[PDB]
Every structure is written in C-alpha cells, then in structure tokens.
C-alpha cells in the first residue's frame, strides 16, 4: 500500500550541492509529516527535519538550517531534499521516512547514497573466477567474479540473470587507494558447470554499465 | 540535545535464548522511545513503538520496557529472522535523537571453512595484472585468518580480505582473501599458497598451485 520511492545513488564534488527525491504513493501525501534521516557510516542515525506537504511547514535540526531544505510537490506527490555545500561529512545513505498517524517512522523509503568527491566515474574491471587445471574433487564447484577498481559506490552481482540464487557469497567491497573492489562466489553442482552458461550480472550504477561475464574452463 | 546511549555496539546469542538490547537516555523521555530495525540491504523496519507496542507483522516474541530514562528490546526466544541491527529512537518534540545501533549476530555451532584457490585469469594476466583469490566458505565462528606464502616466503603486502553478512539461513559466513600483483612479479614466482587458520583446527587447512602447473 505505502510506498516511499527515493531517487539513485549520486556523485557530487565538494562546494556543490544535491537535490533528492521521495515519492510518496498509497496515501494521501498532504496529510502526513515526512522526515529525513542522514545515516553515514559508524556514525548512527541523525535526524535532519520534516516538512508537511499539506501547508508547507517545515522544522529542522538547527545544524541542517541553511544546509539542507525540505520542499514538496503536491501534483507529484514527491518531497525533496537539497543539501548544498558539500563536504565528504556529508556522504552517506539519507532516508524519507513518514511519521504517524499515533505511530513514529510507520514507512521508510530505501534510502539514497550521496558520494562526496572529486574523482571521477570509473566502471569496474571483471575477472573470471576459475578453479586451476584440474586439483580438486568433485561434485560442488566454486566459480567467482573479481569486481575490480570501480568508484564510487555501490556495485551489485547477480549469477545467470538472477535465476541462480542458492550457494552465491558475495563479499563486502573494500576500499583501497581511492577505488573499490569486491568478489562474488558461487558454488554449484558439477553437473551444471562448464554445461550450463554460468554467466555473473555486475551492474553499477554511478556509470550505467551492465556487465556481463562468462565462467568457462581454462585453456588446456 | 537528547543524546541516546546502546549499551553495546554488537551482540552475540543463540538461537532460542533470551535477548535483550538497551538504549538510555539523557534525560528523561516518558514512554517516547522506538526501536527499528535494519537489515544488511539497508532496509529499516518499526517493530516497537511508544516503548512497549508492536507494530506491523511484529512476533510476539518482542517485547519492550522502560522507565523513561532506560529502555530495553526483548526477544523471547531467538530466531534465524532476527538478524539485523536495532536502533532506538526518542520522538519527545523536534529534534528526534537515535541510538547508534547494536548489531545483533546468531552464535552458531562451529564450522570449519571450506578453502578453494584462484589463480589468475588468461584475462587479467593479458592486460598486465595477477590477482590471486583465497576463498574460505560457510565457517563458523566469523574470526578467521588467512597467511599467504609466495615461493614459500610469507606475503602481507597487497592483500585484501573481506568477509560476506552472515547467512541469512545458516548463520555461516564466507570471505576472500585477495592478493594483487603485476603479470611480471606473478610470473616471476612459481607456488602460491594460502593457510587459513580458524578456532575448528589447531592446524591451518592450505590450498596451494604452481605457476607451472602443478
Ligand atoms: C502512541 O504513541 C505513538 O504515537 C505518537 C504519534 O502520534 C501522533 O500522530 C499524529 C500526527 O501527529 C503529527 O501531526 C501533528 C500535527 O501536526 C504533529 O503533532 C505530529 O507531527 C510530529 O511533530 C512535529 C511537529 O511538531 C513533526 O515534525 C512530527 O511529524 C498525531 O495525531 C498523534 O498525536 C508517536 O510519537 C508515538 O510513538
């Protein structure tokens, strides 16, 4: 029913700013307050203001005066929220999220990443992960994607389109000198691989790439 | 402002035991305190609001308690589904305050990893870099240590190790660990092996490939 649909992942540089949204659908926006909640990581939750869509009236934490600013579209349905003079404290994952009626935050949206930075897009190097010639036995193989050297965040990988599910560990990504990297595993019968198109699905976001990579045995 | 305190930042349980997670505040809140959880793909859920009433598809094993300056969640009896991290929440007047969240993991039986090796691809080795993979699967505890040999000398520089959340399923965890060289450094070696030490085994189960073929 409630649904609270909040805009993609963003990269912006130091000193500019950003502008959010958070459709609301399955009630009626102007009857009920919408918040916003800035989560940067190891640093809990923060609670930035709210808006009521209705008559417009806004409050906020006195930090976020003059930083962030809370609008609504009524025609849309939406609340926005634009965040100027931005710092790399201003990275995080920020929530819309509806208050009552006789409950707190009932719904939240999915959250939106902001990344703060002056580097550039870089989509991500893929690499086959594949067994050596021949060592081990026997009836589950483990087959991977490296995801190598991408920014900013996030990456997601998905095996044979999302149809393969079971047995797959996808690691946490790392950052190291300035880039992020992670590797996804999966581990299935001997049966299906090599006979079946074992193929992992990387997307990332920030640079609209969908990448595809076929997991085939080594070169005798 | 109102600043909200967890007792502690992780917390370990079995399943079927007793759980409890506190948060205090700095003055007090009457019965204005909230408990959300969040799972590892972000999403966050009321399950506990004005400090003891259940919200939507909330189990009966939740349970909530207050006295205005301290408050605790309950679970009864630990379930698989439980795994996540919960915060508190005052909603007194504006400004609203969290607590910094308690991480909740299942403490499971002990699992011992199951180790595979990863040479580089034709691929990566083509373009100019070696990246080598060790990967541990389905273990138990999380705590895990992982030594690389290269021609037998130990190897600390350019490794990565990453774990994955745990199991939503079998609270096991796997992670990789990841050894970035140049084509030209790797084919200036030959044997590349990773030990993994884990609390299972007093000794290290070790996967190892030669350059060469074996
Ligand atoms: C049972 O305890 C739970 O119920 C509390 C929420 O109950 C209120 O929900 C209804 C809506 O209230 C919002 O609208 C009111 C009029 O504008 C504001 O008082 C409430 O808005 C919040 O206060 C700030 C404005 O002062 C605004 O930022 C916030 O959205 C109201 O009928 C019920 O009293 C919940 O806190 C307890 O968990």
């Known amino acids: 029913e409630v649904q609270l649909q909040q805009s993609g992942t963003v990269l912006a540089r130091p000193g500019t700013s950003v502008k959010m949204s958070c459709k609301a659908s399955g009630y009626s926006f102007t009857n009920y307050w919408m918040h916003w909640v800035k989560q940067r990581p190891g640093q809990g939750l923060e609670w930035i203001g709210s808006?009521?869509?209705?008559?417009?009236?806004?409050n906020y934490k006195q930090k976020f005066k003059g930083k962030a600013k809370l609008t609504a579209v009524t025609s849309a349905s939406t609340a926005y929220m634009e965040v100027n003079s931005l710092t790399n404290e201003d990275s995080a994952v920020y929530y819309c999220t509806r208050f009552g009626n006789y409950v707190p935050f009932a719904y939240w949206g999915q959250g939106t990443l902001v990344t703060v930075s002056a580097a550039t897009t870089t989509a991500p190097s893929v690499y086959p992960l594949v067994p050596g010639c021949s060592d081990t036995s026997g009836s589950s193989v483990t087959l991977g994607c490296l995801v190598k050297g991408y920014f900013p965040e996030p990456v997601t990988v998905k095996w044979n389109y999302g149809a393969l599910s079971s047995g797959v560990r996808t690691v946490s990504s790392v950052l190291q000198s300035g880039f992020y990297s992670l590797s996804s595993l999966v581990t299935v019968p001997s049966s299906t691989w090599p006979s079946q198109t074992v193929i992992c699905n990387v997307a990332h976001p920030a640079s609209k790439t969908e990448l595809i990579k076929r997991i085939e045995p080594r070169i005798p | 402002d109102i600043q909200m305190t967890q007792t502690t930042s992780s917390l370990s349980a079995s399943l079927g035991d007793r759980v409890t997670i506190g948060c205090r505040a700095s003055?007090?809140?009457?019965?204005?305190l909230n408990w959300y959880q969040q799972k590892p793909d972000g999403a966050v859920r009321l399950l506990i609001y004005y400090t003891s009433r259940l919200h939507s598809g909330v189990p009966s094993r939740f349970s909530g308690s207050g006295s205005g300056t301290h408050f605790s969640l309950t679970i009864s009896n630990l379930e698989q589904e439980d795994i996540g991290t919960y915060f508190c929440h005052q909603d007194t007047k504006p400004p609203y305050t969290f607590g910094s969240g308690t991480k909740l993991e299942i403490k499971r039986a002990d699992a011992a990893p199951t180790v595979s090796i990863f040479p580089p691809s034709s691929e990566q080795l083509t373009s100019g870099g070696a990246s080598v993979v060790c990967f541990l699967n389905n273990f138990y505890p999380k705590d895990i240590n992982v030594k690389w040999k290269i021609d037998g000398s130990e190897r600390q520089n350019g490794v990565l190790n990453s774990w994955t959340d745990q199991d939503s399923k079998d609270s096991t965890y796997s992670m990789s660990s990841t050894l970035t060289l140049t084509k030209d450094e790797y084919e200036r070696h030959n044997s590349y092996t990773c030990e993994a030490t884990h609390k299972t085994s007093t000794s290290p189960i070790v996967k190892s490939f030669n350059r060469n073929e074996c």
């Open positions: 808006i009521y869509p209705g008559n417009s009236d806004t």
């Open positions: 003055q007090d809140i009457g019965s204005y």
